[PDB]
Amino acid sequence: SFLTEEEQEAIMKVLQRDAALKRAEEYDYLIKFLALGDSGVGKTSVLYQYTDGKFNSKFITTVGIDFREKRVVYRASGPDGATGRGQRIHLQLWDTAGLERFRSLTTAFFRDAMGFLLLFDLTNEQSFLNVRNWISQLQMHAYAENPDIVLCGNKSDLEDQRVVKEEEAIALAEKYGIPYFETSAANGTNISQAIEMLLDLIMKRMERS
Amino acid sequence: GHMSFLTEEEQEAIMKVLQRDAALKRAEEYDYLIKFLALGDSGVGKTSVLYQYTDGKFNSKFITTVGIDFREKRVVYRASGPDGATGRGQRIHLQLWDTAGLERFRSLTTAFFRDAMGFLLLFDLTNEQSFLNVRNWISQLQMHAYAENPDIVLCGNKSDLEDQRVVKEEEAIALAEKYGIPYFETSAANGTNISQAIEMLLDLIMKRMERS
Ligand SMILES: Nc1nc2c(ncn2[C@@H]2O[C@H](COP(=O)(O)OP(=O)(O)NP(=O)(O)O)[C@@H](O)[C@H]2O)c(=O)[nH]1
Ligand SMILES: Nc1nc2c(ncn2[C@@H]2O[C@H](COP(=O)(O)OP(=O)(O)NP(=O)(O)O)[C@@H](O)[C@H]2O)c(=O)[nH]1
Ligand SMILES: C=CC(=O)Nc1ccc(S(=O)(=O)N2CCC[C@H]2C(=O)Nc2cccc(OC)c2)cc1
Ligand SMILES: C=CC(=O)Nc1ccc(S(=O)(=O)N2CCC[C@H]2C(=O)Nc2cccc(OC)c2)cc1
Ligand SMILES: [Mg+2]
Ligand SMILES: [Mg+2]
């Protein structure tokens, strides 16, 4: 078991990199958010796909905590399909280990998030079932009582082993008022649609300020 | 080395510390919340200094901090002035992070540097080794504070032990000057300078804050 020196140095590396990044943003605005979910659901894969278009299938469980950036451009996303001239958005995309060994390390990074990507594994029902607790965890620890969440039933490319019925998943999302997307980190289905939704939900919350 | 992962109990603690923090923060979403953070080697006096500060009390049993905690104290801060021009009393809600010191908690404690507008660095006067590591703490603070050239006050703690004092006074004033930081010699037991150092830190933060 016992946590090793080499793994802490990586985490100090991520931390050292975040601390550097914040010091510089000091684009148009920096929009931070955070992906979480049981481990082995594709947080890293999903984010990797989204940023780089690639996908490794070797499972490399996240060493506690990591983050990525995309310099995307956000546009209006207005009513009945409008689009006013949109902004530059530096993105920061936290990736949390879903394991026990880091439940208390990852939960400290919620404070830096402005939205959330809650992931489950369409091929693993317990991923789906534990989704309620994850949401509980987010109201309890995020920095607004009703934090913006987009849910993702990831691994949509593995139909011959999909045990979560879209009915049950849409029903869970409707019960909380959270957008649902079924996603694949293999081939990128809805990977863009889903995080951009969060971005809209997040950017629109700032124009309520 | 062989650093143990957090037991569930250990993680139980820290999760409710976090839960505590979340509420505090959300609640403040007639004041001015100010935070800072205690750090330095294990056993140098970190919690005790803070417990002396908030409750005017001291406990002899070493109760090593399980990763992270924080204490609060309401206070009134009045501006400094060029000819004793002390300004209006500001209510200042104070959150005081107490970080562990054992290395096995290093990356958990460093996470919280983004929440701390200043740092209270402790070594022990009865332990030169703790005093020697202080350079590496400042280097860890330059590296991971979310503002650069961050505000630090350095505390030589345990000053009420003079038969056990080993850190020469001059070596510390030296350091504190080379790095240009306030140095205080403190006692978490009798309370000598505890208040003065913490008041100094908030002052720095306060003046630093209104650079605008
Ligand atoms: N077919 C398919 N496999 C995927 C997809 N996303 C991840 N996987 C696979 O599922 C496993 C889990 O990947 P990973 O990104 O590490 O998941 P994670 O939830 O971030 N793990 P951790 O929480 O430990 O960081 C890997 O073997 C990966 O290749 C996806 O969209 N489709
Ligand atoms: N005589 C004396 N004892 C002190 C003083 N400050 C702390 N102590 C004692 O020395 C030990 C230091 O304990 P404590 O300050 O709680 O540890 P800490 O700095 O928070 N380290 P940790 O990272 O393990 O939580 C305890 O036994 C405490 O009671 C002081 O000024 N004088
Ligand atoms: C939970 C999600 C939700 O639904 N709402 C929600 C909850 C929390 C947060 S937030 O706490 O993370 N947050 C607000 C904006 C940025 C940051 C902040 O406050 N300050 C800051 C200031 C200066 C610099 C700096 O980086 C360099 C950062 C945002 C949205
Ligand atoms: C607070 C301590 C800390 O840990 N970090 C930290 C330190 C300083 C600042 S500072 O911007 O305010 N500042 C500008 C220069 C120094 C200092 C100042 O005002 N006067 C001064 C003090 C000593 C010698 C000296 O040379 C003539 C001048 C901000 C953060
Ligand atoms: Mg991962
Ligand atoms: Mg302590």
CATH label of the domain that carries residue A50: 3.40.50.300
**Per-residue tokens: B125:** 């006067």
Asked, for residue B2, whether it belongs to a domain, the answer is: no
Locate the DSSP E strands across chain A.
29-37, 65-68, 71-74, 87-96, 116-121, 149-154, 180-182
The C-alpha atoms of residue A148 and residue A59 are separated, in whole angstroms, by: 28
Neighbours of A162 (CB within 10 A): 17
Locate the DSSP E strands across B79-192.
89-99, 119-124, 152-157, 183-185
Domain that holds residue B98: 8-209
The C-alpha atoms of residue A176 and residue A180 are separated, in whole angstroms, by: 11
**3-class DSSP state of A207:** coil
The C-alpha atoms of residue B152 and residue B49 are separated, in whole angstroms, by: 16
Q: Give the total residue count for chain A.
A: 209
Candidate from A5, A15, A112 with C-beta closest to B1: A5
**3-class DSSP state of B73:** strand
Q: How many domains does chain A have?
A: 1
Q: Which chain B positions have a beta carbon within 8 Å of A5's beta carbon? A: 1, 3
Spatial CB neighbours of A140, under 8 Å, sequence gap ≥ 6: B19, B22
Rg (CA), chain A: 17
Note whether A179 and A150 are within 8 A (CB): yes
The C-alpha atoms of residue A111 and residue A173 are separated, in whole angstroms, by: 23
Which ranges of chain B does DSSP label H, i.e. alpha helix? 8-28, 46-55, 106-111, 128-132, 134-144, 169-178, 194-209
The C-alpha atoms of residue B50 and residue B71 are separated, in whole angstroms, by: 7
Experimental method: X-ray
Encoded amino acid at B97, one letter: W
In the reported structure, the alpha carbon of residue B206 is separated from the centroid of ligand 4 by a whole-number distance in angstroms of: 13
Nearest to B134, CA basis, from B37, B44, B1: B44
Phi/psi at A71 (5° precision) = -95, 75
Give CA separation, B169 vs A17, B134, B175, in Å.
Answer: 36, 15, 10
User: In the block, which residue shows the tokens 């080379």?
Assistant: B178
**Per-residue tokens: B100:** 């562990």
User: In the block, which residue shows the tokens 């079932």?
Assistant: A129
The residue to mutate among A59, A68, A106, A193, having the most atoms of ligand 1 within 8 angstroms of its beta carbon, is A59
Rg (CA), chain B: 17
**Per-residue tokens: A207:** 């124009």
**Per-residue tokens: A32:** 């931070």
Q: Please judge whether B18 and A104 are an interchain contact, meaning their C-beta atoms are less than 8 angstroms apart.
A: yes
Distance from CA of A110 to the nearest CA of B (A): 9
The C-alpha atoms of residue A86 and residue A75 are separated, in whole angstroms, by: 4
Interface test with A, best of B18, B66, B107, B114 (most A CBs within 10 A): B107
**Per-residue tokens: A8:** 């802490």
Ligand 1 neighbour A155 (Cβ under 6 A): yes
Asked, for residue B1, whether it belongs to a domain, the answer is: no
Looking at residue B147, what DSSP letter applies? Answer: S
The C-alpha atoms of residue A195 and residue A183 are separated, in whole angstroms, by: 11
Dihedral of CA B15/B16/B21/B24: which sign?
Answer: positive
Nearest to B197, CA basis, from B148, B164, B150, B154: B154
Distance between start and end Cα atoms, chain A: 46
Nearest to B96, CA basis, from B9, B195, B184: B195
